[PDB]
Paper text:
Comprising three core subunits (cyt b, cyt c1 and the Rieske iron–sulfur protein (ISP)) along with eight auxiliary subunits, each CIII hosts four metal centres (haems bH and bL in cyt b, the [2Fe–2S] cluster in ISP and haem c1 in cyt c1) and two Q sites: Qi for Q reduction and Qo for QH2 oxidation. In state I, the Q10 headgroup is situated near the [2Fe–2S] cluster at a distance of 10.8 Å, with the Rieske domain exclusively adopting the b position. In states II, III and IV, Q10 takes on the prevalent conformation revealed in our cryo-EM maps, while the Rieske domain undergoes a stepwise movement from the b position towards the c position, eventually making contact with cyt c1 for electron transfer in state IV. To further analyse the detailed conformational changes among these states, we measured two characteristic distances, one from [2Fe–2S] to Q10 and the other to haem c1. Our results indicate a possible sequential progression from state I to state IV, characterized by increasing [2Fe–2S]–Q10 distances and decreasing [2Fe–2S]–haem c1 distances. On the basis of these observations, we propose a model that outlines the coupling between ISP movement and Q-binding states.
Here we report in situ structures of porcine respiratory SCs, determined directly through imaging porcine mitochondria by single-particle analysis combined with cryo-electron tomography (cryo-ET). Our structures, with an average resolution of approximately 2.5 Å and local resolution up to 1.8 Å in the best regions, enable in-depth study of [name] respiratory SCs in their native states. Our in situ structures also capture numerous reactive intermediates within these respiratory supercomplexes, shedding light on the dynamic processes of the ubiquinone/ubiquinol exchange mechanism in complex I and the Q-cycle in complex III.
Author numbering:
A (entry chain 3V): 47 to 77
B (entry chain 3N): 2 to 446
C (entry chain 3R): 79 to 110
D (entry chain 3C): 110 to 379
E (entry chain 3F): 24 to 121
F (entry chain 3C), I (entry chain 3P): 1 to 55
G (entry chain 3O): 22 to 438
H (entry chain 3X): 1 to 52
């Protein structure tokens, strides 16, 4: 998504180390 | 402790109702946290073409300022106790929920009372908020799944309030003054059409007395006489194609009329939907998934991601699928996806029906994990069904579903019904509407 | 801008029964 | 499978076209073979008699049937050509099979510089044989009685069809039950349809299957025996020899070959 | 005894004369094709070369000298495990579809 | 700029049919009969015509 | 109705809780991940994470997929830089079948050559999908520019190893890092005895502590890449403490004093000192948040910033100056109380979901080896004083830095300034 | 072949398609009687038999 | 697995020539005659053959 606003951009920063996850019937996720 | 034993041990959903009409509903557990929110029956459905977009604007300005808390002070109270305050507005419901500890319940309910009631709606903040929504409109334009679903709603319920998008056209948002919003608040944020929900370390008696001492000022009247009624929405099987060859991937959503929140036919159809399944390019199941469409897509690398949906409104819904695939796959899935539906309309084995029942049970029991999903479930169920459906009842209705029931309900909703196709991107290969409608019926059956 | 995409009125070509806010698309589907 | 089935269709069409063509010159053999062959359709239950009167265009092979067969013999070869084109299409979708029976995708050569000249040589040899036949002994494969004007009031001493049909005609003569005779006549060709199903050997060809090789040559000798039997009249010992040959043909195709292949795989650890 | 009959049959089959191994002569159905794809590279290369040499010999209607004939004892069984596994997987799929 | 052999439609069909079609190397003489059929067919279509012209 | 924490002689810790929930989740947390990847087997962990459905010893891929789907259960392999967490969820009446499936997948794989060759493309697909979020690239380059080795290794297979991860590498990784001592079996919705039976039945084959990885060294470098994105994603960190120490809790409290993550949707982060400090300054769309990463042996603490390309130099500067103010003793006790309340809520709220509780128990078992109830965690958080936060800020400011950036870096400053 | 197609759910599919296949066969029978003008059957249908 | 209409060899030609052929959406009735001629051809081939059986 394109972000061009403070409110939408809020929360897109990271404060915890990156954590990937893949499944068998669930799409890939990251945090 | 078997599955059945656990189901009849889930806490109940004690429901009360103050004199003004505000329904208080809680669900005690042992967690030290809680999730308390107010589920109003506002939404884009209750909006005329002149003021479409009022609900989004009101949701935007809800947390900005109040009469009691002038502004950022409200945010300070919310953050000081560690609560996360959120709000989601849809085409039918609009809700505010605070995620906070059990000890902060008296304060959280007060905060929700202030927002839903004594909202400032300052003109300066309205002007500031006007641009933000406009930017968010372009952001949503970048969100291709969302624009495809809005195309679905626009082309399916054309000429009805449901076709209106939640955010509103980027012309109404540029003229929505304070006067329009105030009528929205005073005409939709009423006590009878409100559910004060909470879940977690919440005591139903505590929630009731907090509601009595805070939300008592809520009014149930409708000013002079104006009572916004429920307008039934027609479903006009149509198609819309916004072909933009620059877009890397093509999104196509096709849905037929599904039932409303009533009409228990949802339970069979969901099972049928679970039989179709869902796929994404990053699954890992590969050419082994039980779902025939998923296995074919993985084998031939057809699509990037297809998902089946059962969007459901008060009297009608959009039941169908939405898939994202390259330019030279759109027709092929139209062959397989339709080819899947008719199979369930003509020959649904008991084995796959059992599989769908298990998938549905897993989905229901997993979706109700955590205080926030439970609070959302309570608030949504009290508005849609009028009562929270206990999981045991869900289990019984799922158990009554078998192969014959799925076949009958699919043939009643899928077979020979005009669809509501909506496509975006390089959708040249998308079959013509006549081809899709022809694919909606089988010449063998 | 996608919110500004409104389907043009088809009341000129629409077929008798399906011409109102009333549902008219489930009960009259069989007739048409 | 597709090319084989299309080939069976082509075989049926070619046989019908040749039958009509042989009817055309209106000799004694022509007229009487046409009557004998068409009268088989009277054995078909219910509709059968009507069918004959339909094809005869009347009550016997007569003026109507001659022109009808002329038109059909004219049209059919173009249908054969269309089917041959479809056949080549189907074969090209997979590619030819080598004698060894194994996929030869690694040792493939262009068709033009090699197989065009190979086919030119083959055509030269076939032209040699055909021109020898036409120029030196034209009435070698025919029957002299075909050089007599067709007289419906008298039959030739023998009623035999063309040689390339005798193998099946003998089968017709094997079963006294006329309907059974017609059914066996049709099955004698339709067996090729079932042939792909009966394949039980792990290997594809017969290059490395000596037992199946002896079986195949038994089949070829059996077909030759049926062809010889067809010419001779219905007398001792041709009757019993014909029954033995007809039984052995289906026994070899349906039973002996699959069982031989089953023993065959077992003889090679698979 | 039986193994003598089997050796006689291996001699009379003729694929030893072409340098072919037993598994090179098998018909390539879907299961066999997938098994061949599953083969390790070093086995696959030898399989392809042996097949190509055999096709060459049959094109020129010749056989290898008697010394370079695949002996019955030396006839390894490379494709057998992979084909067995493929057949097992297909049988599992069919049983689940049952 | 291209071969009209492999770009012209009819010529492309002919090329893929019997010019550049990949054929097995070890095809024995028994396969020639395939064409020996077609040639016969052509001959049969030819002479029969000149027969139907006086029959 | 409580949490038992048995430990086996092998080293396996079986933790089980019977909440009598309709569903049940069983998670096997293995102390294996990117940090245990040498310079020759990079990307092996990513493939192992993707190889959660390959043909195992006693269960083929088709059987695994069909059996998990018929029950409708889910099988995830959530992984970090220091631990890989297999997890299976389904109805409590069917948990045994997928327990067998999970145990076959984690303790007896085959890694057939053809299946791994097939998964090689999924490696690239997953890497691209995960990298579509800019935070992934910057967070990866952050570790690459901060740690010399160990934690520097990426969760995603490097581009040059896509198509080269041999099955032998996978077998070595399994029978070197999946030994009983470095694993933990956690169960929610299941009883302890059955968990013990399946443990001592399947996981007992592999024993010992396994091949131990090396320590992490702080290189303190920069990895700056230009990728055309208008938004600049900068991240400036410094060597914080390691989890399980009072300094770790001090750094965690400092994160919330600085401000991390919004609390009011479409809000302004009034209490967040970073957001307020940067707001005085750039009047453009942006975001700044404290960033805390706690690992076994080391850890990082710093600032993550999304900003416009031109204004980035200000946002990195101004926000940094804010931390300087905290280092010089400008922290009122009220902000300390607010941060402690936010931290306590955040911890208690991440154990809300059953999956969240399962992950918390798995992490506690793997790192420490003993369960700690939330009350003790809150007590430890309250034990943090202002001087500890003020330091923590001194340690962040007066230490070697590590910067990772992205986007148009025309105006983004370097770590030297 | 027949080993694979002999299954519980396979007979169940056969049962599902029994009505459609059977009345497809009825369609074929009626069409055959009509096109052929099978007098043996058409002598019993009330209105049509008046044609003969 | 795949649609026979676009995977079968003969059916592929039929599909690409009569079923999924992209034709202009505004061709007037004058474009119908290309069909009629072909149909007329069939009729001429048909009736004439039935004339050949008694001529
Ligand atoms: C020795 C005396 C008898 C020779 C013929 C019989 C025999 O045993 O042939 C074996 C052999 C043919 O069979 P093969 O080589 O064992 O197996 C390969 C195929 O025959 C295919 O081999 P090809 O593609 O080289 O074709 C060879 C074939 C060519 O056959 C044809 O062209 C078709 C038959 C009509 C001519 O020549 C024949 O003689 C076989 C058919 C006639 C047999 C009588 O031919 C020869 O050894 C010499 C053939 C030339 C005449 C001298
Ligand atoms: C009222 C006064 C007479 C009006 C018609 C005569 C005239 O000159 O009209 C010119 C006027 C101007 O032509 P246009 O509309 O610019 O272009 C006509 C299309 O190119 C071609 O025509 P279209 O595709 O726009 O419409 C079909 C049209 C014309 O159909 C055809 O031209 C094909 C049939 C053969 C010729 C007409 C046989 C009658 O059919 C008819 O007008 C009547 C039905 C004829 C049989 C079915 C076709 O056309 C008409 O009024 C209708 C088309 C001509 C009919 C003759
Ligand atoms: C088998 C299909 C019906 C065949 C038949 O003869 O139907 C009766 C009708 C009319 O015949 P009919 O009903 O006068 O007598 C039927 C019995 N036979 C034919 C023995 C006299 O058949 C036809 O019209 C054509 C039959 C052949 C083509 C089929
Ligand atoms: C029957 C099947 C075989 C024949 C058809 C298929 C082979 C191609 C026939 C045409 C050809 O070979 O050359 C045509 C020739 C121009 O050829 P050119 O452009 O020089 O090279 C490109 C390929 N033609 O055209 C010319 O005009 C060149 C001279 C032709 C003879 C005078
Ligand atoms: C101047 C042109 C092509 C027209 C036919 C359509 C294509 C076709 O041949 O379809 C075959 C289809 C096979 O089944 P299908 O499901 O389509 O296969 C793909 C995977 N689902 O066939 C079918 O699905 C139908 C199989 C036969 C049904 C017969 C029913 C009774 C008829 C009397
Ligand atoms: C009208 C007569 C026929 C013509 C013109 C014809 C044409 C051809 C041609 C030219 C070939 C390629 C050359 C070859 O492999 O022989 C061929 C291959 C083939 N034909 Fe025919 N054919 C005819 C009859 C038949 C018949 C009756 C059958 C069997 C039912 C048949 C089955 C085959 C098969 C199986 C192949 C492939 C051979 C292989 O791959 O080794 N054909 N056909
Ligand atoms: C499929 C290829 C063909 C075959 C196998 C075939 C076979 C025959 C046979 C066996 C005869 C009888 C020969 C005899 O009198 O002893 C014949 C005659 C005849 N055929 Fe054909 N024919 C074929 C194609 C054609 C075609 C295409 C035509 C028309 C152009 C045609 C026209 C005739 C005519 C007019 C006669 C009568 C002349 C005569 O019998 O000598 N044939 N054909
Ligand atoms: C290209 C398509 C055709 C055209 C334009 C055409 C044209 C004609 C015409 C104008 C006549 C004269 C009819 C009369 O004066 O009564 C005729 C007669 C005849 N045509 Fe054709 N014809 C065609 C195709 C065929 C075909 C394919 C056959 C053979 C199967 C055929 C067989 C005959 C016969 C036997 C006659 C003589 C009987 C009669 O005069 O009606 N025609 N044709």
């Amino acid at each position: 998504r394109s972000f061009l606003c403070r409110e939408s951009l809020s929360g897109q920063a990271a404060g915890r180390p990156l954590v990937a996850s893949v499944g068998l019937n669930v799409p890939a996720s990251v945090r | 402790a078997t599955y059945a034993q656990a189901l009849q041990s889930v806490p109940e959903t004690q429901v009360s109702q103050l004199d003004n009409g505000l329904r208080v509903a809680s669900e005690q557990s042992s967690q030290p946290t809680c999730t308390v929110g107010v589920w109003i029956d506002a939404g884009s459905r209750y909006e005329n073409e002149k003021n479409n977009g009022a609900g989004y604007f009101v949701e935007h300005l809800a947390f900005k300022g109040t009469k009691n808390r002038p502004g950022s002070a409200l945010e300070k109270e919310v953050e000081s106790m560690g609560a996360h305050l959120n709000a989601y507005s849809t085409r039918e419901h609009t809700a505010y929920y605070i995620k906070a500890l059990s000890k902060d319940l008296p304060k959280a309910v007060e905060l929700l009372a202030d927002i839903v009631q004594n909202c400032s709606l300052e003109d300066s903040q309205i002007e500031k908020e006007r641009d933000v929504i406009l930017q968010e409109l372009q952001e949503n334009d970048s969100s291709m799944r969302d624009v495809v679903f809005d195309y679905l709603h626009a082309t399916a319920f054309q000429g009805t309030p449901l076709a209106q998008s939640v955010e509103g056209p980027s012309e109404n948002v540029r003229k929505l003054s304070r006067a329009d919003l105030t009528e929205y608040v005073s005409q939709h944020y009423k006590a009878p059409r409100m559910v004060l929900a909470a879940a977690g370390g919440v005591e139903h008696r505590q929630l009731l007395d907090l509601a009595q001492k805070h939300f008592s000022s809520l009014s149930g009247t409708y000013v002079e006489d104006a009572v916004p009624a429920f307008t039934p929405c027609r479903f006009t099987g149509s198609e819309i194609r916004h072909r933009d060859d620059a877009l890397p991937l093509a999104h196509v959503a096709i849905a037929v009329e599904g039932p409303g929140w009533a009409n228990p036919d949802n339970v069979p159809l969901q099972v049928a939907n679970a039989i179709i399944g869902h796929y994404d390019s990053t699954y890992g199941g590969g050419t082994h998934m039980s779902s025939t469409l998923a296995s074919v897509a993985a084998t031939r690398k057809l699509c990037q991601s297809f998902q089946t949906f059962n969007i459901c409104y008060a009297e009608t819904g959009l039941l169908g699928a939405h898939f994202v695939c390259d330019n030279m796959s759109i027709d092929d899935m139209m062959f397989f996806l339709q080819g899947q539906w008719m199979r369930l309309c003509t020959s649904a084995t008991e084995s796959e029906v059992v599989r769908g029942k298990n998938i549905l049970r897993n989905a229901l029991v997993s979706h109700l994990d955590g205080t926030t999903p439970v609070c959302e479930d309570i608030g949504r169920s009290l508005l849609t069904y009028g009562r929270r459906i206990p999981l045991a009842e869900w289990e019984s209705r799922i158990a009554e579903v078998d192969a014959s029931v799925v076949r009958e309900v699919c043939s009643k909703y899928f077979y020979d019904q005009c669809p509501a196709v909506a496509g975006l991107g390089p959708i040249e290969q998308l079959p013509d509407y006549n081809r899709i409608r022809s694919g909606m019926f089988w010449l063998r059956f | 801008s996608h919110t500004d995409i409104r389907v043009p009125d088809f009341s000129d070509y629409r077929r008798a029964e399906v011409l109102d806010s009333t549902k008219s698309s489930k009960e009259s589907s069989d007739a048409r | 499978l597709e090319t084989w089935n299309i080939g069976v269709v082509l075989l049926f069409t070619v046989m019908a076209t040749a039958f009509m063509g042989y009817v055309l010159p209106w000799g004694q053999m022509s007229f009487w073979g046409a009557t004998v062959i068409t009268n088989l359709l009277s054995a078909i239950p219910y509709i059968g008699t009507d069918l004959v009167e339909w094809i005869w265009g009347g009550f016997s092979v007569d003026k109507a049937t001659l022109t009808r067969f002329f038109a059909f013999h004219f049209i059919l070869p173009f249908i054969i050509t269309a089917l041959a084109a479809v056949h080549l299409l189907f074969l090209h979708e997979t590619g030819s099979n080598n004698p060894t029976g194994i996929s030869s995708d690694m040792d493939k050569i262009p068709f033009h510089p090699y197989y065009t000249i190979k086919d030119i040589l083959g055509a030269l040899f076939m032209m040699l044989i055909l021109l020898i036949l036409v120029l030196f002994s034209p009435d070698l494969l025919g029957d002299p009685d075909n050089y007599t004007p067709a007289n419906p009031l008298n039959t030739p001493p023998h009623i035999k069809p063309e040689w390339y049909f005798l193998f099946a005609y003998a089968i017709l003569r094997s079963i006294p039950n006329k309907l059974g005779g017609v059914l066996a006549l049709v099955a004698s060709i339709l067996i090729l349809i079932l042939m792909p199903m009966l394949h039980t050997s792990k290997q594809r060809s017969m290059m490395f299957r000596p037992l199946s090789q002896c079986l195949f040559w038994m089949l070829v000798a059996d077909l030759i025996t049926l062809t010889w039997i067809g010419g001779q009249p219905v007398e001792h010992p041709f009757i019993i020899i014909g029954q033995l040959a007809s039984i052995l043909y289906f026994l070899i195709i349906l039973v002996l070959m699959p069982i031989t292949s089953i023993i065959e795989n077992n003889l090679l650890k698979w | 005894w039986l193994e003598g009959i089997r050796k006689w049959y291996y001699n009379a089959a003729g694929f030893n004369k072409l340098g072919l191994m037993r598994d090179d002569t098998i018909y390539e159905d879907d299961d066999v094709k997938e098994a061949i794809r599953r083969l390790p590279e070093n086995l696959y290369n030898d399989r392809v070369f042996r097949i190509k040499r055999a096709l060459d010999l049959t094109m020129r209607q010749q056989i290898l000298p008697k010394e370079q004939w695949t002996k019955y004892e030396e006839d390894k069984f490379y494709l057998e495990p992979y084909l067995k596994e493929v057949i097992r997987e297909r049988k599992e799929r069919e049983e689940w579809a049952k | 700029m291209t071969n009209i052999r492999k770009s012209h439609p009819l010529m492309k069909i002919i090329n893929n049919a019997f010019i550049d079609l990949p054929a097995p190397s070890n095809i024995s003489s028994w396969w020639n009969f395939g064409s020996l059929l077609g040639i016969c067919l052509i001959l049969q279509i030819l002479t029969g015509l000149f027969l139907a012209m006086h029959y | 109705q409580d949490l038992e924490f048995t430990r086996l002689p092998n080293g396996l810790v079986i933790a089980s809780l019977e909440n009598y929930a309709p569903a049940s989740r069983i998670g096997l947390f293995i102390k294996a991940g990117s940090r245990y990847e040498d310079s020759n087997n990079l990307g092996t962990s990513h493939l192992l994470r993707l190889a959660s459905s390959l043909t195992t010893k006693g269960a083929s891929s088709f059987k695994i997929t069909r059996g998990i789907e018929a029950v409708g259960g889910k099988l995830s392999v959530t992984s970090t830089r220091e631990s890989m967490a297999y997890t299976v969820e389904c109805l409590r009446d069917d948990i045994e079948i997928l327990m067998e499936f999970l145990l076959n997948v984690t303790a007896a794989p085959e890694f057939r050559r053809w299946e791994v060759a097939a998964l090689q493309s999924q490696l690239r697909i997953d890497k691209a999908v995960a990298f579509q979020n800019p935070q992934a690239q910057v967070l990866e380059n952050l570790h690459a520019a901060a740690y010399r080795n160990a934690l520097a290794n990426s969760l995603y297979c490097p581009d040059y190893r896509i198509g080269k991860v041999t099955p032998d590498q996978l077998h070595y990784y399994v029978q070197n890092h999946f030994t009983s001592a470095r694993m933990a079996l956690i169960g929610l919705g299941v009883s302890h005895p059955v968990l013990k039976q399946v443990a001592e039945r399947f996981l007992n084959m592999r024993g010992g502590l396994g091949l131990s990885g090396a320590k992490a060294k702080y290189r303190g470098g920069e990895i700056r890449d230009q990728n055309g994105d208008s938004l600049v994603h900068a991240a400036l960190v410094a060597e914080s403490a390691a989890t399980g120490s009072a300094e770790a809790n001090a750094f965690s409290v400092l994160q919330h004093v600085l401000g991390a993550g919004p609390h009011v949707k479409r809000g302004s982060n009034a209490t967040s000192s970073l957001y307020q400090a940067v707001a005085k300054g750039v009047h453009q769309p942006f975001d700044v948040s404290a960033f805390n990463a706690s690992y076994s042996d080391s850890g990082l603490f710093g600032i993550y910033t999304i900003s416009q390309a031109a204004s980035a130099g200000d946002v990195i500067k101004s926000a940094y100056d804010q931390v300087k103010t905290i280092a010089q003793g400008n922290l009122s006790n009220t902000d300390v109380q607010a941060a402690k309340n936010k931290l306590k809520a955040g911890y208690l709220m991440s154990v809300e979901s059953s999956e969240g509780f399962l992950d918390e128990v798995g992490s506690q078992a793997l790192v420490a080896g003993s369960y700690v109830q939330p009350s003790t965690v809150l007590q430890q958080i309250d034990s943090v004083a202002d001087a500890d936060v003020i330091n923590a800020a001194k340690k962040f400011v007066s230490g070697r830095k590590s910067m990772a950036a992205s986007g148009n870096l025309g105006h983004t400053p370097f770590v030297d300034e | 072949m027949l080993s694979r197609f002999l299954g519980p759910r396979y007979r169940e599919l056969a049962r599902n398609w029994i009505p459609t296949a059977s009345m497809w066969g009825a369609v074929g029978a009626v069409g055959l009687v009509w096109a052929t003008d099978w007098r043996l059957i058409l002598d019993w249908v009330p209105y049509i038999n008046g044609k003969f």
